Design a binder for this molecule. Structure first.
Ligand SMILES: *[C@@H]1O[C@H](CO)[C@@H](O[C@@H]2O[C@H](CO)[C@@H](O)[C@H](O)[C@H]2NC(C)=O)[C@H](O)[C@H]1NC(C)=O
Ligand SMILES: *[C@@H]1O[C@H](CO)[C@@H](O[C@@H]2O[C@H](CO)[C@@H](O)[C@H](O)[C@H]2NC(C)=O)[C@H](O)[C@H]1NC(C)=O
Ligand SMILES: *[C@@H]1O[C@H](CO)[C@@H](O[C@@H]2O[C@H](CO)[C@@H](O)[C@H](O)[C@H]2NC(C)=O)[C@H](O)[C@H]1NC(C)=O
Ligand SMILES: *[C@@H]1O[C@H](CO)[C@@H](O[C@@H]2O[C@H](CO)[C@@H](O)[C@H](O)[C@H]2NC(C)=O)[C@H](O)[C@H]1NC(C)=O
Ligand SMILES: *[C@@H]1O[C@H](CO)[C@@H](O[C@@H]2O[C@H](CO)[C@@H](O)[C@H](O)[C@H]2NC(C)=O)[C@H](O)[C@H]1NC(C)=O
Ligand SMILES: *[C@@H]1O[C@H](CO)[C@@H](O[C@@H]2O[C@H](CO)[C@@H](O)[C@H](O)[C@H]2NC(C)=O)[C@H](O)[C@H]1NC(C)=O
Ligand SMILES: *[C@@H]1O[C@H](CO)[C@@H](O[C@@H]2O[C@H](CO)[C@@H](O)[C@H](O)[C@H]2NC(C)=O)[C@H](O)[C@H]1NC(C)=O
Ligand SMILES: CC(=O)N[C@@H]1[C@@H](O)[C@H](O)[C@@H](CO)O[C@H]1O
Ligand SMILES: *[C@@H]1O[C@H](CO)[C@@H](O)[C@H](O)[C@H]1NC(C)=O
Ligand SMILES: *[C@@H]1O[C@H](CO)[C@@H](O)[C@H](O)[C@H]1NC(C)=O
Ligand SMILES: *[C@@H]1O[C@H](CO)[C@@H](O)[C@H](O)[C@H]1NC(C)=O
Ligand SMILES: *[C@@H]1O[C@H](CO)[C@@H](O)[C@H](O)[C@H]1NC(C)=O
Ligand SMILES: *[C@@H]1O[C@H](CO)[C@@H](O)[C@H](O)[C@H]1NC(C)=O
Ligand SMILES: *[C@@H]1O[C@H](CO)[C@@H](O)[C@H](O)[C@H]1NC(C)=O
Lengths: 219, 196, 165, 146
């Protein structure tokens, strides 16, 4: 509806939560070519050694990849100097992070939503090495980044971590998108109720949609 | 520099390998076997040597699509962060970014990022808004802090407190609406100047 | 394995044998490979020390100063219940290091813990700042190799070149 | 030849995943440890914050975005006249409800009376295209006179 004299302005908003899924590593396969090619034979090995450094460099190549799967998982998760933690009391202005903060009742350190993320993804000189960081050492870094985020905004990225009340960090957020912070405070119960409603739809969408992690299942 | 020396040394070393032939030395197939037999041996050294290069070249190509991604990221850092200032977090060192100076190194770039890091710090009590005449006041270029006995407003990234005024604040609505609003007094510098 | 009367042996997807019918005694046998794994040598570096510790990858310790990791069986490294920054990596949260002396093995420290002083009404603000110069180093260019293919394959030999064509 | 093929497929695959790891690290550095003005880089809407979640071999972000969801048509003008001088908002935009002119922030309808604090002056009603006539309130005159 364009003209030289008409403008449209937001009268109301939704906070919305969206899910973005990225692969970060491949399964760390490693191979012994000699056992693959020449399984149980020194006569075959005496022939294969005539081909020289093709035997070695296949394994150097897969070593470079295998070591790099841990260099990836460090740069993606281990960005924070310290394991930050939330207080036991949840005075986050009405914003109910209980579905995405860690559950201490369960054996691995993951949240309610991360436990859906583990449910929705699945002999011959060939081998699969382990990751350097266990799934619960990843869940400790996602908890540290998330606990730093809820309690201290960007400030724990910039240097030492500085606490701030959560609904006042959201005033910094709304000013970062040109909405002045009186719009947050004049709607804080609505904003928290929309956010809590949205997170509840992330549980139901991931619970019902068995294919949701297609970007990871295909890797 | 190691990998681009090691793949060369690996590819030189594959000249000594026999590949199932009588020998790896080319004159010593020829000066030993007659051409009908020497061609069946040299077809082995050619198939070996050639599979050597095709694997070496596949590695230098996959490696080049890695140094390329590094050089695009070095170009993007030099653009956004030598030639500019970046608001991207952790993209140009741990800090808030001021500037950077690029230095040359053999086969590489060496930025000196210069970053402002928040150092020494103090706790404060704080308020989302303040009352004064039933109207609710919010900061303009900072946040409200109590030192323990006096309310102030300060810039979010460096403690430098100032008297709460209608120059340092703006208004909306009333104190019924804002959760956690505090009662305090706002100075107006117009009033001494209207009394004078 | 419920074999058919006419079937003499079973094969795996790799076409090697999975099972056989014994020709003297009426029974069906599995065949399993003899247990195997990589041998990896955790080395404190020869300038510091000439101890080493050996990881036999994936095996249970049974087939090999010993430690079962989820990575395999680790021998010559001393388990410790404390955590430290990962000096040499191993797997499944384990790392090793050389400490005042022996090679030790333990779960690596992710970082110092810090519960945050959060409340609905309190902020921290920096009173001073610190200008830090941080180096960042990136590759720009490979060495510009080119190979004379035919001198590599057939150097000083026309009689090779006539096949290479 | 069946190994050098598979090791090539994996050396290629590994650069396709290292691209997704570098993209995840760059999202996490900016989209989580900061706030992203970078449009659509952190989900549709404007970026408030995002929450990292572990997953098998990967990462999931939950992005929290502010989305404009109800809207109304208003008449607008690039400037207003009052003293034959021209007035522009300091922040926000001019809108008419059909009988009164107001100034409001660009991303949320919250109309305010037009003033020498909500606006600033440069030039005059001659040079600015599309300027209209209004009635700038001055908060100083009632207080000078009383
Ligand atoms: C902005 O939109 C929200 C809904 O997204 C409105 O909140 C709802 O208001 C209706 C009554 O009109 C109630 O039935 C709902 O329970 C409210 N929902 C929530 C989540 O609280 C809100 O009133 C609108 N605001 C304005 C100014 O129009
Ligand atoms: C946060 O949301 C959870 C639901 O995910 C709420 O947990 C429920 O709380 C009621 C009592 O209010 C219990 O009867 C339910 O059994 C709980 N359900 C689950 C799945 O735990 C929780 O109360 C909310 N917290 C806040 C602070 O609002
Ligand atoms: C909070 O800040 C105010 C202003 O700096 C402090 O009040 C002043 O204190 C000095 C003595 O240190 C007096 O000479 C001034 O006259 C005071 N000014 C006012 C306006 O009262 C106050 O002491 C600080 N509070 C604390 C707990 O340190
Ligand atoms: C801020 O000050 C006002 C008075 O200026 C306080 O208002 C009182 O509120 C209580 C509870 O509703 C009433 O019993 C009193 O009669 C009110 N006083 C007046 C003069 O009307 C207000 O509660 C104070 N708020 C805070 C957070 O301290
Ligand atoms: C911020 O911290 C610096 C130190 O990192 C302070 O500077 C030092 O001050 C002491 C005396 O108090 C001197 O002995 C040092 O030589 C100073 N060092 C430098 C590099 O100047 C600085 O005064 C502090 N700033 C504030 C505002 O408190
Ligand atoms: C445009 O907005 C103004 C208010 O900002 C409206 O004028 C007010 O209308 C109410 C209801 O009739 C009266 O009680 C007020 O006294 C009016 N204020 C002024 C300054 O006149 C006006 O009605 C709105 N116009 C439209 C078309 O919505
Ligand atoms: C704003 O008001 C002024 C008068 O204060 C208008 O000026 C008139 O312009 C026309 C066209 O040139 C002249 O014929 C009139 O004589 C002018 N009036 C006076 C009193 O000198 C101006 O046009 C108005 N602007 C808008 C956009 O309506
Ligand atoms: C919020 C609102 O009412 N917007 C209207 C739009 O619905 C209508 O289609 C257009 C004219 O075509 O004018 C404007
Ligand atoms: C802030 O308060 C906590 C206790 O709530 C205390 O541990 C911390 O050291 C204080 N820090 C500063 C800089 O005042
Ligand atoms: C803040 O927390 C305290 C302690 O539970 C509580 O008494 C107070 O009412 C809270 N205030 C607000 C504005 O949340
Ligand atoms: C390590 O090497 C240096 C020489 O490069 C030598 O001086 C030093 O003694 C060595 N370290 C130990 C622990 O001996
Ligand atoms: C390893 O051997 C022990 C017996 O010493 C046995 O109890 C354990 O279950 C075995 N583990 C595996 C993975 O085979
Ligand atoms: C580690 O601690 C447990 C008790 O939590 C104990 O049983 C075990 O023997 C300890 N191991 C060592 C090496 O101290
Ligand atoms: C807008 O366009 C109309 C013609 O459709 C014209 O009469 C009017 O003067 C124009 N106004 C401006 C501010 O461009």
């Amino acid at each position: 509806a364009y003209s030289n004299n008409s403008i449209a302005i937001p009268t109301n908003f939704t906070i919305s939560v969206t899910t973005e899924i990225l692969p970060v590593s491949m399964t760390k396969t490693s191979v012994d070519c000699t056992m693959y090619i020449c399984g149980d034979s020194t006569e075959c090995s005496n022939l294969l050694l005539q081909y020289g450094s093709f035997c070695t460099q296949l394994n150097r190549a897969l070593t470079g990849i295998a070591v790099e799967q841990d260099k990836n998982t460090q740069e993606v998760f281990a960005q924070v100097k310290q394991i930050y933690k939330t207080p036991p009391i949840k005075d986050f202005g009405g914003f109910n992070f209980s579905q995405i903060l860690p559950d201490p009742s369960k054996p691995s350190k993951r949240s309610f939503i991360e436990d859906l993320l583990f449910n929705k993804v699945t002999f011959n000189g060939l081998t699969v090495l382990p990751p350097l960081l266990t799934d619960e050492m990843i869940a400790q870094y996602t908890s540290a980044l998330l606990a730093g985020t809820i309690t201290s905004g960007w400030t724990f990225g910039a240097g030492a971590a500085l606490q701030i009340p959560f609904a006042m960090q959201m005033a910094y957020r709304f000013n970062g998108i040109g909405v002045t912070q009186n719009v947050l405070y004049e709607n804080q119960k609505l904003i928290a109720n929309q956010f809590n409603s949205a997170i509840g739809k992330i549980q139901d969408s991931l619970s019902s949609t068995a294919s949701a992690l297609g970007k990871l299942q295909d890797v | 520099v190691n990998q681009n020396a090691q793949a060369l040394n690996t590819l030189v070393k594959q000249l000594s390998s026999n590949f199932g032939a009588i020998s790896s030395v080319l004159n010593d197939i020829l000066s030993r076997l007659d051409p009908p037999e020497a061609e069946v041996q040299i077809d082995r050294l050619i198939t070996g040597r050639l599979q050597s290069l095709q694997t070496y070249v596949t590695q230098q190509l996959i490696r080049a699509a890695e140094i390329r991604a590094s050089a695009n990221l070095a170009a993007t850092k030099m653009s956004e962060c030598v030639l500019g200032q970046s608001k991207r977090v952790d993209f140009c060192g741990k800090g808030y970014h001021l500037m950077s100076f690029p230095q040359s190194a053999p086969h590489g770039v060496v930025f000196l990022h210069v970053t402002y890091v928040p150092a020494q710090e103090k706790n404060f009590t704080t308020a989302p808004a303040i009352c004064h005449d039933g109207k609710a006041h919010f900061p303009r270029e900072g946040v409200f802090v109590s030192n323990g006995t006096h309310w102030f407003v300060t810039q979010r990234n460096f403690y430098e407190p100032q008297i709460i005024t209608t120059d340092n604040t703006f208004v909306s609505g009333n104190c019924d609406v804002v959760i956690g609003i505090v009662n305090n007094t706002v100075y107006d510098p117009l009033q001494p100047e209207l009394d004078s | 394995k419920k074999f058919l009367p006419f079937q003499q042996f079973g094969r795996d997807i790799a076409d090697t044998t999975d099972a056989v019918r014994d020709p003297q005694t009426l029974e069906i046998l599995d065949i399993t490979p003899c247990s195997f794994g990589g041998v990896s040598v955790i080395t404190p570096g020869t300038n510091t020390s000439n101890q080493v510790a050996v990881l036999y990858q994936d095996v249970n310790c049974t087939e090999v100063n010993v430690f079962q990791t989820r990575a395999g069986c680790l021998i010559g490294a001393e388990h410790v219940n404390n955590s430290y920054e990962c000096d040499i990596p191993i797997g499944a949260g384990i790392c090793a290091s050389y400490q005042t002396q022996s090679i030790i093995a333990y779960t690596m420290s992710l970082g110092a813990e810090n519960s945050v002083a959060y409340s609905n009404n309190s902020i921290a603000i920096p009173t001073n700042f610190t200008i830090s110069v941080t180096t960042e180093i990136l590759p720009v260019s490979m060495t510009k190799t080119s190979v004379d293919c035919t001198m590599y394959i057939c150097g000083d030999s026309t009689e090779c070149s006539n096949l290479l064509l």
